Amino acid sequence: VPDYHEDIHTYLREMEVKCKPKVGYMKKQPDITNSMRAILVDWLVEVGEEYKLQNETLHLAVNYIDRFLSSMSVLRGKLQLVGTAAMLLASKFEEIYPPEVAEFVYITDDTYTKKQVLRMEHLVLKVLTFDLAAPTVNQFLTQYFLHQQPANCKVESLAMFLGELSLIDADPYLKYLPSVIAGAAFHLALYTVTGQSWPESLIRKTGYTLESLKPCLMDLHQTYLKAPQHAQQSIREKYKNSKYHGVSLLNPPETLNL
Template sequence: MQKKRRPMVGYIENVQRFITTNMRGILVDWLVEVAEEYKLLPQTLHLAVSYIDRFLSIHVVNRSKLQLLGVSCMLVASKYEEITPPKAVDFCHITDNTYELKEVIKMEAEILKSLNFEMGNPHVNTFLNEFIGFATENQKTSKLQMEFLCNYLAELSLLDYECIRFLPSTVAASVIFLARFIIR
């Protein structure tokens, strides 16, 4: 499952004509703020970024539609993960009404169709909780301290386009290793 439903490594260089790694990073950074604004789960953010990367692996997207793709992926991910997800109109509002409701809904449908409605895929956050349990077992380290640091590092990994080269479990294990190194 981990190897399935993955973005294509090198999609920005090989598929995208108008999007750069820097633009992707800016979008993800903004989506972190959106997730904080709506108090979304970390899983929602990770899933949304996964959808963005998978979609960009198969479709050329114009610069002007990148933010639309981002909020639409966040909408899909929030419907998948959240108990009470924000409404599509909320995502229009967060873009300062740059996009109309019908554009967000149309993009949502395009995302779902393009990804064959395969929306449940493992991401870094999927593995973190299990790994944190192992990492804090028989340790003096506070589990809460470890969770906060790991979630922060996992969020940072979303910003780095090069991290898509690695399986989510590998990135999660690296996050645990780095967190333990920092805490010691």
């Protein structure tokens, strides 16, 4: 039933521009940094794995985090609290069975209390004005996959892998829209696995070309290339699993054909 696919794609393209966190927001933070943020996000990849949560749930939580940090000053000791609160909210929103607060308190090695996680939950909701239905890189990828020539699960897993890596690094990824990061991930993954490129059917749909995706693609290819040396490794480990066809183990191409 592809009756609403186009309406939905258009709606998401409209909403992503709204639910977009301030690109240079980290400069405004008196204490936290992009490196502390990378540390937080990496731990959330682990938490998502521990409780077998959906990848969408992880993407949503990062969106909430960045939007909250885009307006609220947070000292390093409360950062994991914002992360835990955001994951709880994303689980409630996205999961059939979201982990209970006690499970989230536990997973922080009991750093904060249940009441604290709930007050933070109260704070994030207030700051985000309950606007939790945010578009994600994951939501766009899911739409682009429907254009494979033919369907390839290794391509899908590698694309999802690339999209997740984008979450870890505020610089440079905060500067691209979810739909753009998803375009770059789909092409890089497809190219890596099959040698094929961004389908023209997807140009008709998104209005994006390799030329418009290029800047994101250059960044992403470098991230893909340097991935084994990154301080954060929870995503690479996650994607070594046969569930994802061990795609993090694949070798990125040396150059692209742009």
